[PDB]
Design an enzyme around this catalytic site. Structure first.
Site, PDB file in Angstrom:
ATOM      1  N   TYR A 119       5.741  -4.499  -1.800  1.00 59.32           N
ATOM      2  CA  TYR A 119       6.598  -4.834  -1.041  1.00 59.32           C
ATOM      3  C   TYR A 119       6.977  -3.890  -0.075  1.00 59.32           C
ATOM      4  O   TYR A 119       6.677  -2.561  -0.204  1.00 59.32           O
ATOM      5  CB  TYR A 119       8.053  -5.437  -1.610  1.00 59.32           C
ATOM      6  CG  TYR A 119       8.332  -4.248  -2.787  1.00 59.32           C
ATOM      7  CD1 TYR A 119       8.334  -2.923  -2.705  1.00 59.32           C
ATOM      8  CD2 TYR A 119       8.333  -4.886  -4.179  1.00 59.32           C
ATOM      9  CE1 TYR A 119       8.691  -2.135  -3.885  1.00 59.32           C
ATOM     10  CE2 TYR A 119       8.570  -3.985  -5.450  1.00 59.32           C
ATOM     11  CZ  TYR A 119       8.661  -2.511  -5.085  1.00 59.32           C
ATOM     12  OH  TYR A 119       8.771  -1.822  -6.085  1.00 59.32           O
ATOM     13  N   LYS A 165      15.413  11.828  -9.563  1.00 57.77           N
ATOM     14  CA  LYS A 165      16.873  12.336  -8.853  1.00 57.77           C
ATOM     15  C   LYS A 165      17.677  11.216  -9.481  1.00 57.77           C
ATOM     16  O   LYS A 165      18.763  10.856  -9.056  1.00 57.77           O
ATOM     17  CB  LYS A 165      16.711  12.023  -7.322  1.00 57.77           C
ATOM     18  CG  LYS A 165      17.987  12.448  -6.638  1.00 57.77           C
ATOM     19  CD  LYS A 165      17.718  13.669  -5.929  1.00 57.77           C
ATOM     20  CE  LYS A 165      19.045  14.330  -4.958  1.00 57.77           C
ATOM     21  NZ  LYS A 165      18.787  15.559  -4.703  1.00 57.77           N
ATOM     22  N   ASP A 198      14.880  18.475  -6.776  1.00 60.53           N
ATOM     23  CA  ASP A 198      15.363  19.490  -6.060  1.00 60.53           C
ATOM     24  C   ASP A 198      14.796  20.892  -6.737  1.00 60.53           C
ATOM     25  O   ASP A 198      14.321  21.650  -6.398  1.00 60.53           O
ATOM     26  CB  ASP A 198      16.814  19.401  -6.004  1.00 60.53           C
ATOM     27  CG  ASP A 198      17.247  18.244  -5.141  1.00 60.53           C
ATOM     28  OD1 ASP A 198      16.738  18.104  -4.013  1.00 60.53           O
ATOM     29  OD2 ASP A 198      18.052  17.536  -5.787  1.00 60.53           O
ATOM     30  N   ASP A 222       6.183  12.894  -1.060  1.00 63.48           N
ATOM     31  CA  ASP A 222       5.751  13.415   0.477  1.00 63.48           C
ATOM     32  C   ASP A 222       6.107  15.084   0.640  1.00 63.48           C
ATOM     33  O   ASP A 222       5.197  15.929   0.719  1.00 63.48           O
ATOM     34  CB  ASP A 222       6.427  12.725   1.612  1.00 63.48           C
ATOM     35  CG  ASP A 222       6.087  11.196   1.416  1.00 63.48           C
ATOM     36  OD1 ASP A 222       5.036  11.045   1.467  1.00 63.48           O
ATOM     37  OD2 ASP A 222       7.175  10.105   1.408  1.00 63.48           O
ATOM     38  N   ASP A 226       3.819  18.212   0.385  1.00 61.49           N
ATOM     39  CA  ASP A 226       3.595  19.166   1.771  1.00 61.49           C
ATOM     40  C   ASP A 226       4.001  20.536   1.531  1.00 61.49           C
ATOM     41  O   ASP A 226       3.592  21.717   2.103  1.00 61.49           O
ATOM     42  CB  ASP A 226       4.446  18.717   2.895  1.00 61.49           C
ATOM     43  CG  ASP A 226       3.757  17.498   3.914  1.00 61.49           C
ATOM     44  OD1 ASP A 226       4.216  17.067   4.824  1.00 61.49           O
ATOM     45  OD2 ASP A 226       2.835  16.841   3.152  1.00 61.49           O
TER      46      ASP A 226
END
Lengths: 326, 333, 333, 326
Positions: A119, A165, A198, A222, A226
């Protein structure tokens, strides 16, 4: 023999894909290739970034290697392929390379879901308020968790961290966390640890050696990947894979960049080819390719992006030669 | 005089807040301290982590300095985070988190930045919902919220030497929400021609922070992105043990260490008061006492470099010894 | 003179619009007609149901009268509803649907009301999404949209004899959305002390409309509720065959019959032009020619009562015969 | 014997439930009763509208009959029961009664889902914009469709109309429509027709005889049922049922109103008891009860709400007597 679909894509892709093909042939494996087209340049000539024929070719092969990509009617080729073929597992390794500006000892893999196969997360704006949906489903979480667990089970450390999270998003992130942990019961050999995203970001900077395999959700994967790339040399050398239940597409992480001159570093494309070999079951061949790449990055010539001035073709030759000596 | 509300909170908060108070008193500034209670220990005695009287005291002061809050493993009915509650109740929308090199083991040199992101709950709680096997979380961006946070970040940037601001966003994948944020901040930026404003995709920002952190000064971003960027930045400078933070609204602000209450070492007198003292420095800056703020920071840096050092920094000194050294250093700086 | 944009649309629209034009001309008012194209037939020839020139012509006139639009069974790529498009493009936010007794078989006496609900697409399209086995549809209410529609309904109510307005809502089950709607309309109502405003839960409104429709005059409600209430009301007066409607924005408006294009009888000259003529009467009212509007309505009622009657009303008269009778009746009323 | 849980609730409930119990005993069926408490009055004395003991009693019985219901800590008893017990099928019949102000020939049943058993449709407000979720799931649609199909299969007409809004809400309403039609393939004996809800409302007013069983979604069912009630005498005489997979709760539709005087019309409560009998498998007994009620409404005395001045107790006596003569 293995059928590999080769798609150069745009710009530098025209230089690094043929280079990757060269290294692949050098392995001595029974390989066959099927050229296909995709990307911006393909759009300008075909009217679509991903011609129907390209999808057919991809499906006719065991795996696909993609170079790089750079308006109404146009859409991201890689984004389209992930959805069309449901390549739900986004796999991005981060490994220390013998290159100036790389933290040593780093060796991890970050796995996150490519959602569009199931989706598209909708965005909506009403007057002065815009809302973006972050969606987590039990099905999607079970799939990506199992994918990450298998990857960890095939690695020495046998370690997996679930970066979440759930502390601030108990319903969505909690469903993700709980589901992956449930699937983990089927992998008693894998040591699973939970970690707030985090804190994971901070620990990747302070002591990345701690991680082996990390599984996380969309937006978090992501940035973590990176961040990790920043630790081992930037995206320039980063390979990636998009794996589904029937096939997979591998490609360098960085864009199509320069180009045309032949100074593009084919490392990422070659390492993506290595990821592909591993995926096909040729782990030994994959290790040799990776080793050959390291040997050249360490001693052999070096492309502009790495201080050197060697050309794509020269760098590739060294790898081929080095690979032959291994 | 300046009215300062002091809230020790839980655990080591009982040690680092009094220490920060001593350093503030060492400036000789006209400060009136008003003590208030908040936290887990307060909840255990009053049924709420933030008594109404505490909210009243905060509102009666120019600024508030908070110590630490204990967060139990399991969820306790009726207990909610104190800082989260205050952000909402008082609409302390600007979350300000500096990341700066310190003369300590593990800290990379050349890092001096501030990450600003909004605390949304003063305007609205982003709702989550689950329907059968599908859970959905709202990521909300509004023009009003973006205008405010953008202006707050621009003001901070203009108050710093580099006069540089980066807008970290994901409008490339979230054009409606992240685009609204980006466009709005850029609009308010037109009023700050002295500040050099650049846009940067958050993913690239993360990579650059690891490779070339010196290129950044002030970074403004949205909710969840700020969180990860700050922790990433903290990693570069040794962690979160010495990190101060602020939550600023239109009429007042609350400053506090990012570090937790460290319950198991509370009362042992070994907690490092650096974060609380630097939070007090952020507070002085906010109050308009910028020179005193700079002196407090210099005193902290001098002691961090020459000792005495508490256990967390490889030393064996006490909270008291460290605090007295900062107080003495401040007098000559 | 008044500039009136005429859009026949599809099927019987080609018969009832020219008829309505004749009746308008019979008033002798200074009217300049501007023809434009829209609909399925237009789509088949131009690739769009609403050519840019049509939008331009509508904007160049004081008001527009639209006939009918054909809606094919299956979805045709590129084809979208003309009225839906115009509501959005021109933000014709006030959907106005009267329900009134007529001297015809099946119509209950004593019904004279107007239901007003917003057309939301001028401000935003309420989005739907599906995630696996779960589909979700947004029901959106905003203060701005509620203020506008409330004011529109209050103005209509004040322009009517009864000076009565009912706010049909579901704030009892949807306190945030329906409550925002209710509270906002009640707030704007403070500026219309001459209008007696009452609140009513939509479910109860539905029941009362069936049992005692005479208690209502103007009813203002939200999106989907207005739809069902109007069709319920239409049932009381014989159906939708004679029903006119309007879509009014801040600068212009489009009026049209609720009935479809009836493709299979198009060109046979038996379509009942009542709805189109009454839509023209609504348009005159909107334009400030209230007396002429009342005369047109009286002429329609006289012919409906005494004949000639078209087939839909049990008669065997033609569209032409009916139209000429209305024109002749109008002169004496 | 059948175990029936009786809950008077608030106000008029104290008058109509005992009345319903009387009629039930008059049927001569082997019945047993278990009194339980729920509602506003129960909240003021217990601190909760639905004591845990009440839920236990309900579960210990085959069916429950509820009278009526009328601040922090307080919640709707019926709303709580639907969620707690997942009484997903909301059944509301509309039948012409021999009473002045009733359209003759009307005989239909409207079925809609009680959603909270699976999930609560969330409302949210952000500044000047408020959003309410309308949720449709395949599971919920399959359940309510099957429930409606069974009800139609047990009625003479063998006819079911699916009232939807798929024309404007293709994803949610379309999923509802398509799913019910899929389940309908398992009920070849039932004639299924699709109808836009707006047109259904208009046809209920013009010629309600057209309908037998109507299945629809949440918000639509409400208005259609109230519209229908308006056609046959108002909510005053309307019975209703909330049926789950293990048990069911039946109750008059109208609130708790008056009261105390004993002029409350027990018709709805009695017809709800009739619905309960049908649910228990005692259709014949249910028909007799309904017939007895009609006989009295036609010839016998009449309570205030019906122009008459008869008392609840008098009306009930007539029904009992009439029931005995049948």
């Amino acid at each position: 023999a293995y059928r590999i679909c080769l798609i150069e894509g745009d710009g530098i892709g025209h230089e690094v894909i043929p280079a990757a093909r060269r290294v692949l042939e050098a392995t001595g494996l029974p390989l066959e290739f099927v050229e296909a087209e995709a990307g911006w340049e393909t759009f300008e000539r075909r009217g679509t970034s991903v011609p129907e024929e390209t999808v057919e070719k991809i499906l006719s092969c065991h795996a696909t290697l993609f170079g790089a990509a750079t308006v109404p009617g146009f859409f991201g080729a890689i984004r389209y392929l992930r959805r069309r073929l449901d390549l739900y597992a986004n796999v991005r390794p981060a490994k220390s390379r013998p290159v100036p500006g790389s933290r040593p000892g780093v060796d991890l893999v970050i796995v996150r879901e490519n959602t569009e196969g199931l989706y598209v997360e909708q965005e909506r704006r009403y007057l002065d308020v815009a809302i973006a949906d972050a969606v987590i489903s039990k099905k999607a979480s079970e799939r990506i968790g199992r994918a990450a667990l298998r990857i960890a089970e095939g690695r020495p450390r046998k370690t997996l961290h679930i970066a979440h999270k759930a502390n601030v998003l108990p319903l969505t992130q909690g469903l993700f966390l709980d589901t992956v942990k449930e699937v983990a019961k089927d992998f008693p050999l894998v040591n699973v640890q939970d970690i707030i995203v985090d804190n994971c970001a901070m620990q990747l900077v302070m002591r990345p050696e701690r991680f082996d395999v990390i599984v996380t959700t969309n937006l978090l994967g992501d940035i973590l990947s990176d961040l990790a790339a920043g630790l081992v040399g930037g995206l320039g050398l980063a390979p990636s894979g998009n794996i589904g239940d029937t096939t997979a597409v591998f490609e360098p992480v960085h864009g199509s960049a320069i180009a045309g001159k032949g100074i593009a570093n084919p490392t990422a494309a070659i390492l993506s080819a290595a990821m592909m070999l591993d995926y096909l079951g040729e782990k030994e061949a994959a290790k040799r390719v990776e080793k050959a790449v390291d040997l050249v990055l360490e001693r052999g010539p070096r492309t502009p992006d790495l201080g050197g001035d060697a050309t794509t073709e020269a760098f590739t030759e060294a790898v081929v030669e080095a690979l032959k000596s291994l």
